[PDB]
Design a protein around this ligand. Structure first.
Ligand code: CLA
Ligand code: CLA
Ligand code: CLA
Ligand code: CLA
Ligand code: CLA
Ligand code: CLA
Ligand code: CLA
Ligand SMILES: CCCCCCCCCCCCCCCC(=O)OC[C@H](COP(=O)(O)OC[C@@H](O)CO)OC(=O)CCCCCCCCCCCCCCC
Ligand SMILES: CC1=C(/C=C/C(C)=C/C=C/C(C)=C/C=C/C=C(C)/C=C/C=C(C)/C=C/C2=C(C)C[C@H](O)CC2(C)C)C(C)(C)C[C@H](O)C1
Ligand SMILES: CC1=C(/C=C/C(C)=C/C=CC(/C)=C/C=C/C=C(C)/C=C/C=C(C)/C=C/C2=C(C)CCCC2(C)C)C(C)(C)CCC1
Ligand SMILES: CC1=C(C/C=C(\C)CCC[C@H](C)CCC[C@H](C)CCCC(C)C)C(=O)c2ccccc2C1=O
Ligand code: SF4
Ligand code: SF4
Lengths: 743, 73, 73, 73, 80, 138, 155, 61
């Protein structure tokens, strides 16, 4: 039994500006003076690498706890900024009065160089830039009706940021916990499961029951936002809550008497989207938060902490052992308690996967009101969370490789799952590479074959609905099962979880909110393309992590480090052999996969879901059924999607969307500038810099800091950074301009 | 492809493929006469430059011919 | 026409810069004084001395090929 | 088609001329027999030539792209 | 079949031998420096061209030069 | 030498020598230890070196030398010998080849691959054109 | 051919088009309310800008074309801004060169380059207001151009 | 050329060619390159000093 106690060191680090005037103080090599321009880049490259600074785990743990506080403060400042922008420079009240007619906007551009044109006529009196972040819908779902609440929330956010600033400084210069702290994974998990998530969802459920539910009910009943009672009135005067929800007449007595069924007025399970706003029923959302809170709270009492009751993660890990895995998960507990890189890899992979799942679930089941009708917001949110998820996944792979190169130990990883995997890494990577080849052929080859057939006039020999058909029978079957679930497998559910599986369509403000997303041959091919790209990117990352320590080409890659340029022009060439380079390649592949994924979502939504509905139910999509026969060929993807939909971003000049068009061009430049750093080497730039330095010497204007070219690894990093920035910015401007100009 | 990815990722990949080919039944009989190896550093630059050049020329050739044809035909 | 002719000038000058630099620095450079001893086309000199990727003159030609395609484009 | 044809071939031809000049410097040039020659002198002040070419290319790029983006904005 | 050549500017610091991963270099008695030792490459058949020695050389201009020539199984680092 | 020497306790792995090693060169490393240390095999994995004599086979000289480097660094083991075995069966002593580490100056070694003066005196490629001579050759 | 914009119908047509574009959006708003005043200021600025540009030369497209041939009549178009740019950038270059020359005289010039010495940096920035005159006398004294620099093999 | 004597380099392949450097020490064991020279500037390998011969250096003032 180990005491889960708190031990801290007081005044461990002094608070002074002495170290601010000595850049590179955290590194022994960087504290001796630059001597070259490469030191400037190395200073920032190794600034947040706390593991390279010192060899003590305690110091790294403290440098992480702090700086986590700093990032939390940065997030709180950003949130406060969003709330203040909504309260001061946004048409939030006007939007509340007419959510469908008024375009959300919370940014006002200053009139200086003709940029005042960017202030679009979003309505509501004010003119500004239309925001697609969903801030307006979220605030409405939270019960915000006046800008005073937005101002108070902004002030509270600023205060929380100040608190997260003080906490970060206090936990590094006034009270720094010892390594025994931070190694209590059982206590940290129990608290995060029952306090950070469990109690958090419980509190949010309470807020929704007492604020979101009544305010939104009155809003959806035709009551003006100014005439709705204040949130505190619903708590003080129980008569109002009783009138809006008779369940409140019984009070909390039913909860304590197990007569939970009496809460059918506030805790419903309707299942579908609200026909008035198009979003999920707030009652179902509150009931969902209550259930997730109770489930997380119960889950938070699993591990053992300072008491006999509970579980030991190490015991559970070591208990799992089988014939095909000699030692099972033995030694993994010590791995996740002595290396922050391993924990960061697992957490980054899970956080990225969670973000991707969030994107899918948010578009399919619009949670906020009027979110579905605001297609710009829907496109931006799905695409945004999809991108952040992919970036976090690539980062997860990078940190896994980092741990493998630096924190790995043969004694700890002996005959366990990790060691057993490293033993047969060749089978893993060759079989996975074979899967990638098969997927690419059977996914992209289908598209290429269709291009060849259509060009030859042999349309009868294509992979389409009319010609050879490839129907996702399994996915279509799951959709049908979901369509029939509300009556045979969900007895208490009154409607399908998502109308995208089937049921009927929902229209709000003469606009389609969510209708069944039928899958055909085009969806079959695109889904296989998605799987192919995911397989190749995971192959690149897994290869980099498995061979991070050694390989048949370089027997001691670990000694060379995780981030090294190459072993030289030997053994035929060992360029981009380090794991860091594998992450560098995985970034491009993740970008390609994610770009294709967002492209499919955008086109499919604009051709089969998003659109207008005329009286009597007639439906007219933005691109009427063109995805069925145009998404099956690369030519169609270039003509009906990249060319047809780009007209909005190229013709945006002279209007409020001109900025997007400008960003559309700028991004291209950046994407084309990255090529400079990707198809070139530092030897040539060093020679060019030598000639330029001679020119400077001829005028006695040479700098003391010897100018040097970017390192090989730094050059690769700059190239990938510019490539991703340009590509994501181009598709960002294209998506936003296309969705704002139409729909 | 060749202009971005350099030799070293492909060398290890080919080693993995070599292991797979010589460790699978019914296909061990077939043995490569020349040991598989990744494209050399300079060979990669030349192959990538040739691909880029072929694409640049063919893309603009198709564009110019098709545009001048459809526009005036 | 004035602006695009200036762009044409930019391209011609940058391509001749890369090519002239490749021809003049083909025998040696402060980074690799013995470049002439390694021939015209060689991969590199390893990551030593900060890095020597694309040090050979052949790479200067390969870097100038992209600029020629851009200028002529 | 013909204008683009000949211009692209011209670009390839001039780039090849410069590449062969570099090959000449590395393989068919002996400074011992070219002393104080115009060619040897070119190699003597190569740094000045490269620096001025770099300045011209930088000036043209900065100004031409600045004017194009200014008009665009 | 790469050719490794040691020049007279060698200071006998042994860093090239210590950084060579194929036992291609060694130290032999010499009288051109106070160290009384000079780098030698009597096993160049095992060299692969990684140039780790070139990177580990401290002289102004590398006293050890590795020229990539004939390619064999050893030089290509093929375990298959 | 001593092909019957005991081997470290390893559980296989898919990174060991392939068929090519059978029909071609196959390196071997034989070292002695006093404690059953756990070392990372150059092929990927973890093994326990038998207390006493340890003998293992590899497909590359660099792999054996890397293993020797880690045995000398992670552990104070300096009596590591690397041999080479050909398909015919004749063994060849490769490392250290003389009982002394390469970076340790030892008598009896003859300088190989020496060039007079610095590299700045190398002849131009034009002076040795159409001949079987190199610039580094004096 | 080029004609003054004040006498070109294209210029007036463009001015009217811009005014119409602004007025179309201005009509939606109310006289005294947020916005509508924002568009009136833009219209006034458009009128002033066109009246200012009327003196320039423009062709058929009506876009003001700038003559850079060096004609005195068009000095304000390119000559004056060209001279003012050269003065500003020569000032920047000369102050930077002097600061570098001073830093090279310190014990560790690298530290000065990283952590700029605001006192001396400002001392050289404030000065140099006569950089064209300072460029000379430095050249005449031989303190501007160097004699021997770093050169690789085959000079 | 002795202790701390400014000397200009003459080696063409040297990174500090045509540059001045200080003499840290001079060998007396009859070696090929007995003059150790240190420079304020660093080369591409991060090293500032190196050995040279008498014929490869010229004393300055
Ligand atoms: C962390 C989440 C959270 C938080 C902070 C709150 C916070 C609050 N809730 Mg609440 N609630 C939540 C979640 C949450 N809730 C959830 C998940 C549910 C289920 C969906 C409810 C359902 C609920 C109801 C129905 C009511 C509240 C009420 C309240 C407020 C007073 C509670 C109270 O003590 O009254 C105590 C009330 C009692 C009846 C005590 C029970 C035992 C008494 C002593 C019986 C003995 C007889 C006696 C004579 C009293 C007669 C009462 C009878 C006439 C009803 C309070 C601010 C009450 C309120 O103020 O309405 C605005 C209210 O009626 N909540
Ligand atoms: C004014 C109060 C104060 C003072 C005097 C110090 C002083 C010191 N701190 Mg400290 N610290 C503070 C507050 C303070 N800190 C707070 C509030 C936190 C919580 C975040 C921390 C957490 C912290 C950690 C974890 C560490 C230190 C360390 C140090 C020491 C060296 C590092 C350094 O200061 O370089 C100066 C560095 C900066 C000025 C960069 C900071 C950048 C800020 C935090 C965020 C930037 C956000 C964003 C990118 C801005 C937008 C820019 C652009 C993109 C638009 C030094 C004695 C380090 C040490 O080694 O101690 C010996 C150490 O590891 N501090
Ligand atoms: C129920 C108790 C509890 C709660 C609610 C939290 C909550 C949190 N912890 Mg934490 N932790 C706890 C107990 C708890 N912890 C214990 C007992 C240990 C030791 C075993 C740890 C050790 C620990 C570490 C090492 C780290 C965290 C981190 C975090 C933050 C994760 C980042 C995030 O998701 O943003 C969500 C943010 C919010 C929702 C804002 C809420 C913030 C308020 C102030 C609630 C937190 C209360 C705090 C735990 C205790 C107050 C102390 C009091 C003296 C003032 C989050 C705020 C990480 C972090 O970010 O560092 C700062 C991290 O590095 N925790
Ligand atoms: C919670 C997420 C998270 C965290 C905490 C870390 C933490 C860390 N990472 Mg990691 N990483 C992450 C996510 C994360 N990473 C993701 C998502 C990726 C994929 C992109 C990576 C890929 C990655 C690599 C490849 C490496 C690290 C490294 C590191 C370590 C050192 C970082 C450093 O000092 O560089 C300093 C940071 C900078 C100099 C900033 C670079 C700026 C880039 C280009 C982003 C620009 C964004 C911005 C929006 C651009 C537009 C604005 C512009 C116009 C100005 C450190 C412990 C390095 C390491 O382990 O050391 C060996 C390492 O090599 N990371
Ligand atoms: C995934 C999207 C995508 C991608 C990756 C590409 C990629 C490419 N396209 Mg393409 N294209 C796309 C979508 C895409 N296209 C779509 C949706 C359409 C409409 C159907 C087109 C229509 C199209 C045409 C008509 C052409 C291409 C061409 C090309 C190739 C140009 C070769 C090069 O290196 O650039 C070179 C880049 C440039 C020359 C600049 C391009 C445009 C700028 C604005 C011209 C400015 C000229 C100016 C005078 C230069 C000086 C300015 C400077 C001083 C500031 C390249 C392979 C061209 C080609 O055949 O290759 C030569 C070609 O003519 N594309
Ligand atoms: C969009 C693609 C692109 C662009 C813009 C450039 C641009 C340039 N290349 Mg180049 N190149 C490219 C692709 C590109 N290349 C590719 C694919 C290759 C094949 C590998 C090459 C290979 C190559 C070689 C071999 C050489 C160049 C050289 C040059 C420079 C020529 C001199 C000049 O015009 O300077 C003018 C500057 C510009 C045109 C850049 C615009 C100015 C910027 C935007 C201003 C500064 C940033 C600004 C403040 C905004 C950022 C703010 C910040 C907060 C984020 C120039 C900067 C030559 C050189 O070095 O010249 C001396 C050189 O020899 N390139
Ligand atoms: C003391 C500052 C300074 C001075 C006086 C010069 C002067 C010169 N440079 Mg240079 N340069 C500088 C900084 C400076 N440069 C910096 C910081 C860079 C890296 C971006 C370069 C990169 C550079 C290149 C690539 C080239 C020159 C070239 C030249 C020469 C021709 C003009 C030119 O093309 O400029 C070009 C100027 C730039 C590209 C950007 C200048 C950067 C800023 C805006 C100015 C410096 C501000 C400085 C920090 C001020 C210090 C003030 C002090 C009091 C604290 C000329 C003698 C050319 C040459 O080789 O000669 C023929 C050439 O090709 N420079
Ligand atoms: C065969 C029925 C399963 C349907 C296939 C999809 C299952 C999804 C789980 C993925 C792993 C595959 C299950 C066998 C794997 C499995 O569970 O085996 C059983 C075994 C686990 O049993 P142990 O006795 O080792 O249990 C002890 C430890 O697990 C302690 O928890 O796992 C292995 O040791 C081998 C691991 C992968 C072996 C290589 C297979 C790789 C192929 C991957 C592709 C799978 C098929 C793709 C879909 C067509
Ligand atoms: C478990 C148990 C029970 C009761 C357990 C109880 C009472 C649990 C209570 C949980 C509560 C009250 C949790 C409260 C959570 C959070 C609150 C009240 C405030 C949160 C933060 C807000 C509202 C602000 C958020 C911002 C916004 C929205 C954006 C930021 O930019 C700025 C900023 C202002 C920070 C019963 C059954 C009664 C018996 C008892 O013996 C045991
Ligand atoms: C009649 C007349 C005229 C005249 C003119 C003149 C007389 C001039 C010119 C001209 C010229 C004059 C031109 C040119 C061109 C050139 C070029 C295009 C070049 C080149 C080169 C290259 C490309 C390279 C080289 C090299 C190298 C690389 C290295 C080694 C050496 C050599 C040399 C081989 C005009 C039209 C005005 C007008 C009318 C009248
Ligand atoms: C262009 C390029 C270079 C040259 C790029 C350089 C030298 C970029 C660094 C230049 C910096 C950004 C300019 C100096 C900034 C100073 C701080 C000056 C600021 C002065 C005022 C503006 C404040 C490489 O070194 C390279 C290396 C390896 C692969 C590809 C490439 C590559 O593509
Ligand atoms: S210099 Fe570049 S191309 Fe050459 S081996 Fe090193 S990383 Fe590879
Ligand atoms: S190139 Fe590599 S293997 Fe060859 S001698 Fe040098 S360090 Fe040894």
């Amino acid at each position: 039994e180990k005491q889960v106690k708190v031990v801290v060191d007081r005044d461990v680090v002094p608070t002074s500006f002495e170290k601010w005037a000595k850049p590179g103080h955290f590194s022994r090599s960087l504290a001796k003076g630059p001597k070259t321009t490469t030191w400037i880049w190395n200073l920032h490259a190794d600034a947040h690498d706390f593991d390279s600074h010192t060899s003590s785990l305690e110091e790294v743990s403290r440098k992480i706890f702090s700086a986590h506080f700093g990032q939390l403060a940065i997030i709180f400042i950003w949130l406060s900024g969003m709330y203040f922008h909504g309260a001061r420079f946004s048409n939030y009240v006007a939007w509340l009065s007419n959510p469908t007619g008024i375009k959300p906007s919370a940014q006002v551009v200053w009139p200086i160089v003709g940029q005042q044109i960017l202030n679009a006529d979003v309505g509501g009196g004010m003119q500004g830039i239309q925001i697609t972040s969903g801030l307006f819908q979220l605030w409405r779902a939270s019960g915000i009706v006046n800008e005073l609440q937005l101002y108070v929330t902004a002030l509270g956010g600023l205060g929380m940021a100040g608190l997260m600033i003080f906490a970060g400084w206090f936990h590094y210069h006034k009270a720094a916990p010892k390594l025994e702290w931070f190694q209590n994974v059982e206590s940290m998990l129990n608290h995060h499961l029952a306090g950070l998530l469990g109690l958090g969802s419980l509190s949010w459920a309470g807020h929704q029951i007492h604020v979101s539910l009544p305010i939104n009910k009155l809003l959806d009943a035709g009551v003006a936002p100014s005439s709705i009672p204040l949130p505190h009135e619903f708590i003080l005067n129980r008569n109002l809550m009783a009138e809006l929800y008779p369940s409140f007449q019984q009070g909390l007595v039913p909860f304590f008497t197990l007569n939970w069924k009496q809460y059918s007025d506030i805790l419903t399970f309707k299942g579908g989207l609200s026909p008035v706003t198009g979003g999920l029923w707030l009652t179902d959302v509150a009931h969902h938060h209550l259930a997730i809170a109770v489930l997380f709270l119960v889950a938070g009492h699993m591990y053992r902490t300072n008491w006999g009751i509970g579980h030991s993660i190490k015991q559970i890990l070591e208990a799992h052992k089988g014939p095909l895995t000699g030692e099972g998960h033995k030694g993994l507990y010590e791995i996740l308690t002595t290396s922050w890189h391993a924990n960061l890899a697992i957490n980054l992979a899970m956080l990225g996967s969670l973000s991707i799942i969030v994107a899918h679930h948010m578009y399919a089941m619009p949670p906020y009101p009027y979110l579905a009708t605001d297609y710009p917001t829907q496109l931006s949110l799905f695409t945004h969370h999809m991108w952040i998820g992919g970036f976090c996944i690539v980062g997860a792979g990078a940190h896994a490789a980092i741990y493998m190169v630096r924190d790995y130990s043969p004694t700890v990883n002996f005959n366990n799952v990790l060691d057993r995997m490293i033993r047969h890494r060749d089978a893993i990577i060759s079989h996975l590479n074979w899967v990638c080849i098969f997927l690419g052929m059977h996914s992209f080859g289908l598209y290429i074959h269709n291009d060849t057939m259509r060009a030859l006039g042999r349309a009868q020999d294509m992979f389409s609905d009319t010609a050879i058909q490839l129907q996702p029978v399994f996915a279509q079957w799951i959709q049908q099962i979901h369509t029939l679930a509300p009556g045979n497998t969900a007895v208490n559910a009154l409607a399908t979880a998502s109308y995208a599986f089937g049921a009927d369509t929902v229209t709000v403000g003469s606009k389609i909110a969510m209708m069944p997303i039928k899958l055909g041959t085009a969806d079959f091919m695109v889904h296989h393309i998605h799987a192919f790209t995911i397989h190749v990117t995971t192959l690149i990352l897994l290869k980099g992590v498995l061979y991070a320590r050694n390989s048949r080409l370089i027997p001691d890659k670990a000694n060379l480090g995780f981030r090294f340029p190459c072993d030289g022009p030997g053994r035929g060439g060992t360029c981009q052999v380090s794991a860091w380079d594998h992450v560098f390649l995985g970034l491009f592949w993740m970008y390609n996969a994610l770009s294709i994924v967002i492209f499919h979502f955008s086109w499919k939504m604009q051709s089969d879901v998003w659109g207008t509905v005329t009286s009597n139910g007639a439906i007219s999509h933005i691109t009427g059924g063109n995805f069925a026969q145009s998404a099956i060929t690369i030519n169609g993807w270039l003509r009906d999607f990249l060319w047809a939909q780009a007209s909005q971003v190229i013709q945006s000049y002279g209007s409020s969307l001109s900025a997007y068009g400008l960003m559309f061009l700028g991004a291209h430049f950046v994407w084309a500038f990255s090529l400079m750093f990707l198809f070139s080497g530092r030897g040539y730039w060093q020679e060019l810099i030598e000639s330029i330095v001679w020119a400077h010497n001829k005028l006695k204007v040479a700098p003391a800091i010897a100018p040097r070219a970017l390192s090989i690894t730094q050059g690769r990093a700059v190239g990938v950074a510019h490539y991703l920035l340009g590509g994501i910015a181009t598709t960002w401007a294209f998506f936003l301009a296309r969705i704002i100009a139409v729909g | 492809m060749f202009l971005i990815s350099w030799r070293g990722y492909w060398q290890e990949l080919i080693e993995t493929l070599a292991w797979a080919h010589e460790r699978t039944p019914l296909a061990n009989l077939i043995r490569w006469k020349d040991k598989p190896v990744a494209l050399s550093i300079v060979q990669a630059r030349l192959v990538g430059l040739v691909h880029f050049t072929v694409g640049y020329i063919l893309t603009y050739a198709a564009f110019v011919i098709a545009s001048t044809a459809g526009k005036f035909s | 026409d004035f602006l695009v002719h200036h762009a044409i000038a930019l391209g011609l000058h940058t391509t001749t810069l890369i090519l002239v630099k490749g021809a003049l620095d083909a025998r040696g450079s402060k980074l690799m004084p013995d470049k002439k001893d390694f021939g015209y086309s060689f991969p590199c000199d390893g990551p030593g001395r900060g890095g020597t990727c694309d040090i050979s003159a052949w790479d200067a030609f390969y870097l100038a090929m992209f600029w020629m395609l851009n200028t002529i484009g | 088609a013909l204008y683009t044809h000949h211009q692209y071939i011209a670009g390839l031809l001039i780039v090849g001329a410069f590449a062969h000049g570099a090959i000449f410097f590395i393989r068919d040039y002996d400074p011992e027999q070219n002393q104080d020659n115009v060619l040897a002198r070119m190699l003597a002040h190569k740094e000045a030539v490269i620096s001025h070419l770099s300045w011209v290319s930088l000036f043209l790029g900065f100004h031409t792209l600045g004017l194009y983006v200014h008009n665009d904005v | 079949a790469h050719t490794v050549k040691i020049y007279d500017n060698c200071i006998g610091c042994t860093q090239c031998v210590r950084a060579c991963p194929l036992d291609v270099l060694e130290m032999v008695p010499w009288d051109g420096c106070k160290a009384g030792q000079m780098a030698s490459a009597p096993r160049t058949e095992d060299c692969v061209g990684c140039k780790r020695c070139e990177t580990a050389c401290p002289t102004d201009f590398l006293s050890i030069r590795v020229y990539l020539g004939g390619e064999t199984t050893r030089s290509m680092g093929l375990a298959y | 030498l001593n092909l019957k020497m005991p081997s470290p306790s390893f559980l296989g792995s898919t990174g060991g020598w392939l068929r090519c090693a059978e029909t071609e060169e196959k390196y071997a490393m034989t070292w002695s230890s006093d404690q059953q240390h756990i070392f990372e095999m150059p092929t990927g994995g973890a093994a326990v070196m038998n207390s006493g004599d340890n003998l293992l086979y590899l497909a590359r000289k660099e792999q054996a030398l890397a293993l020797a480097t880690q045995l000398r660094t992670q552990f104070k083991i300096q009596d590591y010998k690397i041999y080479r075995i050909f398909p015919s069966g004749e063994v060849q002593y490769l490392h250290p080849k003389d009982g002394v580490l390469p970076y340790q100056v030892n008598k009896g070694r003859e300088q190989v691959g020496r060039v007079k003066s610095t590299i700045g005196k190398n002849v131009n490629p034009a002076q040795v054109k159409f001949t079987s001579k190199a610039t580094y050759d004096r | 051919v080029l004609t003054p914009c004040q006498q070109s119908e294209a210029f007036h047509k463009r001015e009217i088009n811009e005014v119409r574009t602004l007025e179309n959006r201005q009509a939606n708003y109310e006289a005294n309310s947020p916005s509508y005043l924002a568009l009136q200021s833009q219209i006034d600025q458009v009128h002033k800008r066109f009246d200012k540009y009327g003196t320039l030369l423009c062709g058929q497209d009506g876009l003001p074309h700038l003559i850079t041939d060096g004609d005195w009549r068009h000095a304000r178009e390119f000559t004056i801004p060209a001279l003012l740019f050269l003065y500003i950038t020569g000032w920047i270059g000369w102050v930077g060169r002097s600061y570098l020359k001073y830093t090279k005289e310190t014990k560790n010039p690298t530290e000065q380059e990283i952590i700029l010495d605001v006192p001396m940096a400002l001392k050289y920035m404030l000065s140099g207001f006569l950089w064209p005159l300072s460029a000379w006398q430095e050249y005449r004294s031989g303190q501007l151009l160097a004699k021997e620099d770093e050169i690789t093999v085959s000079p | 050329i002795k202790k701390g004597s400014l000397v200009k380099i003459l080696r063409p392949e040297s990174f500090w060619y045509n540059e001045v450097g200080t003499v840290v020490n001079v060998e007396t064991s009859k070696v090929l390159y007995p003059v150790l020279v240190r420079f304020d500037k660093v080369n591409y390998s991060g090293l500032n000093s190196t050995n040279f011969s008498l014929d490869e250096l010229v004393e300055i003032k």
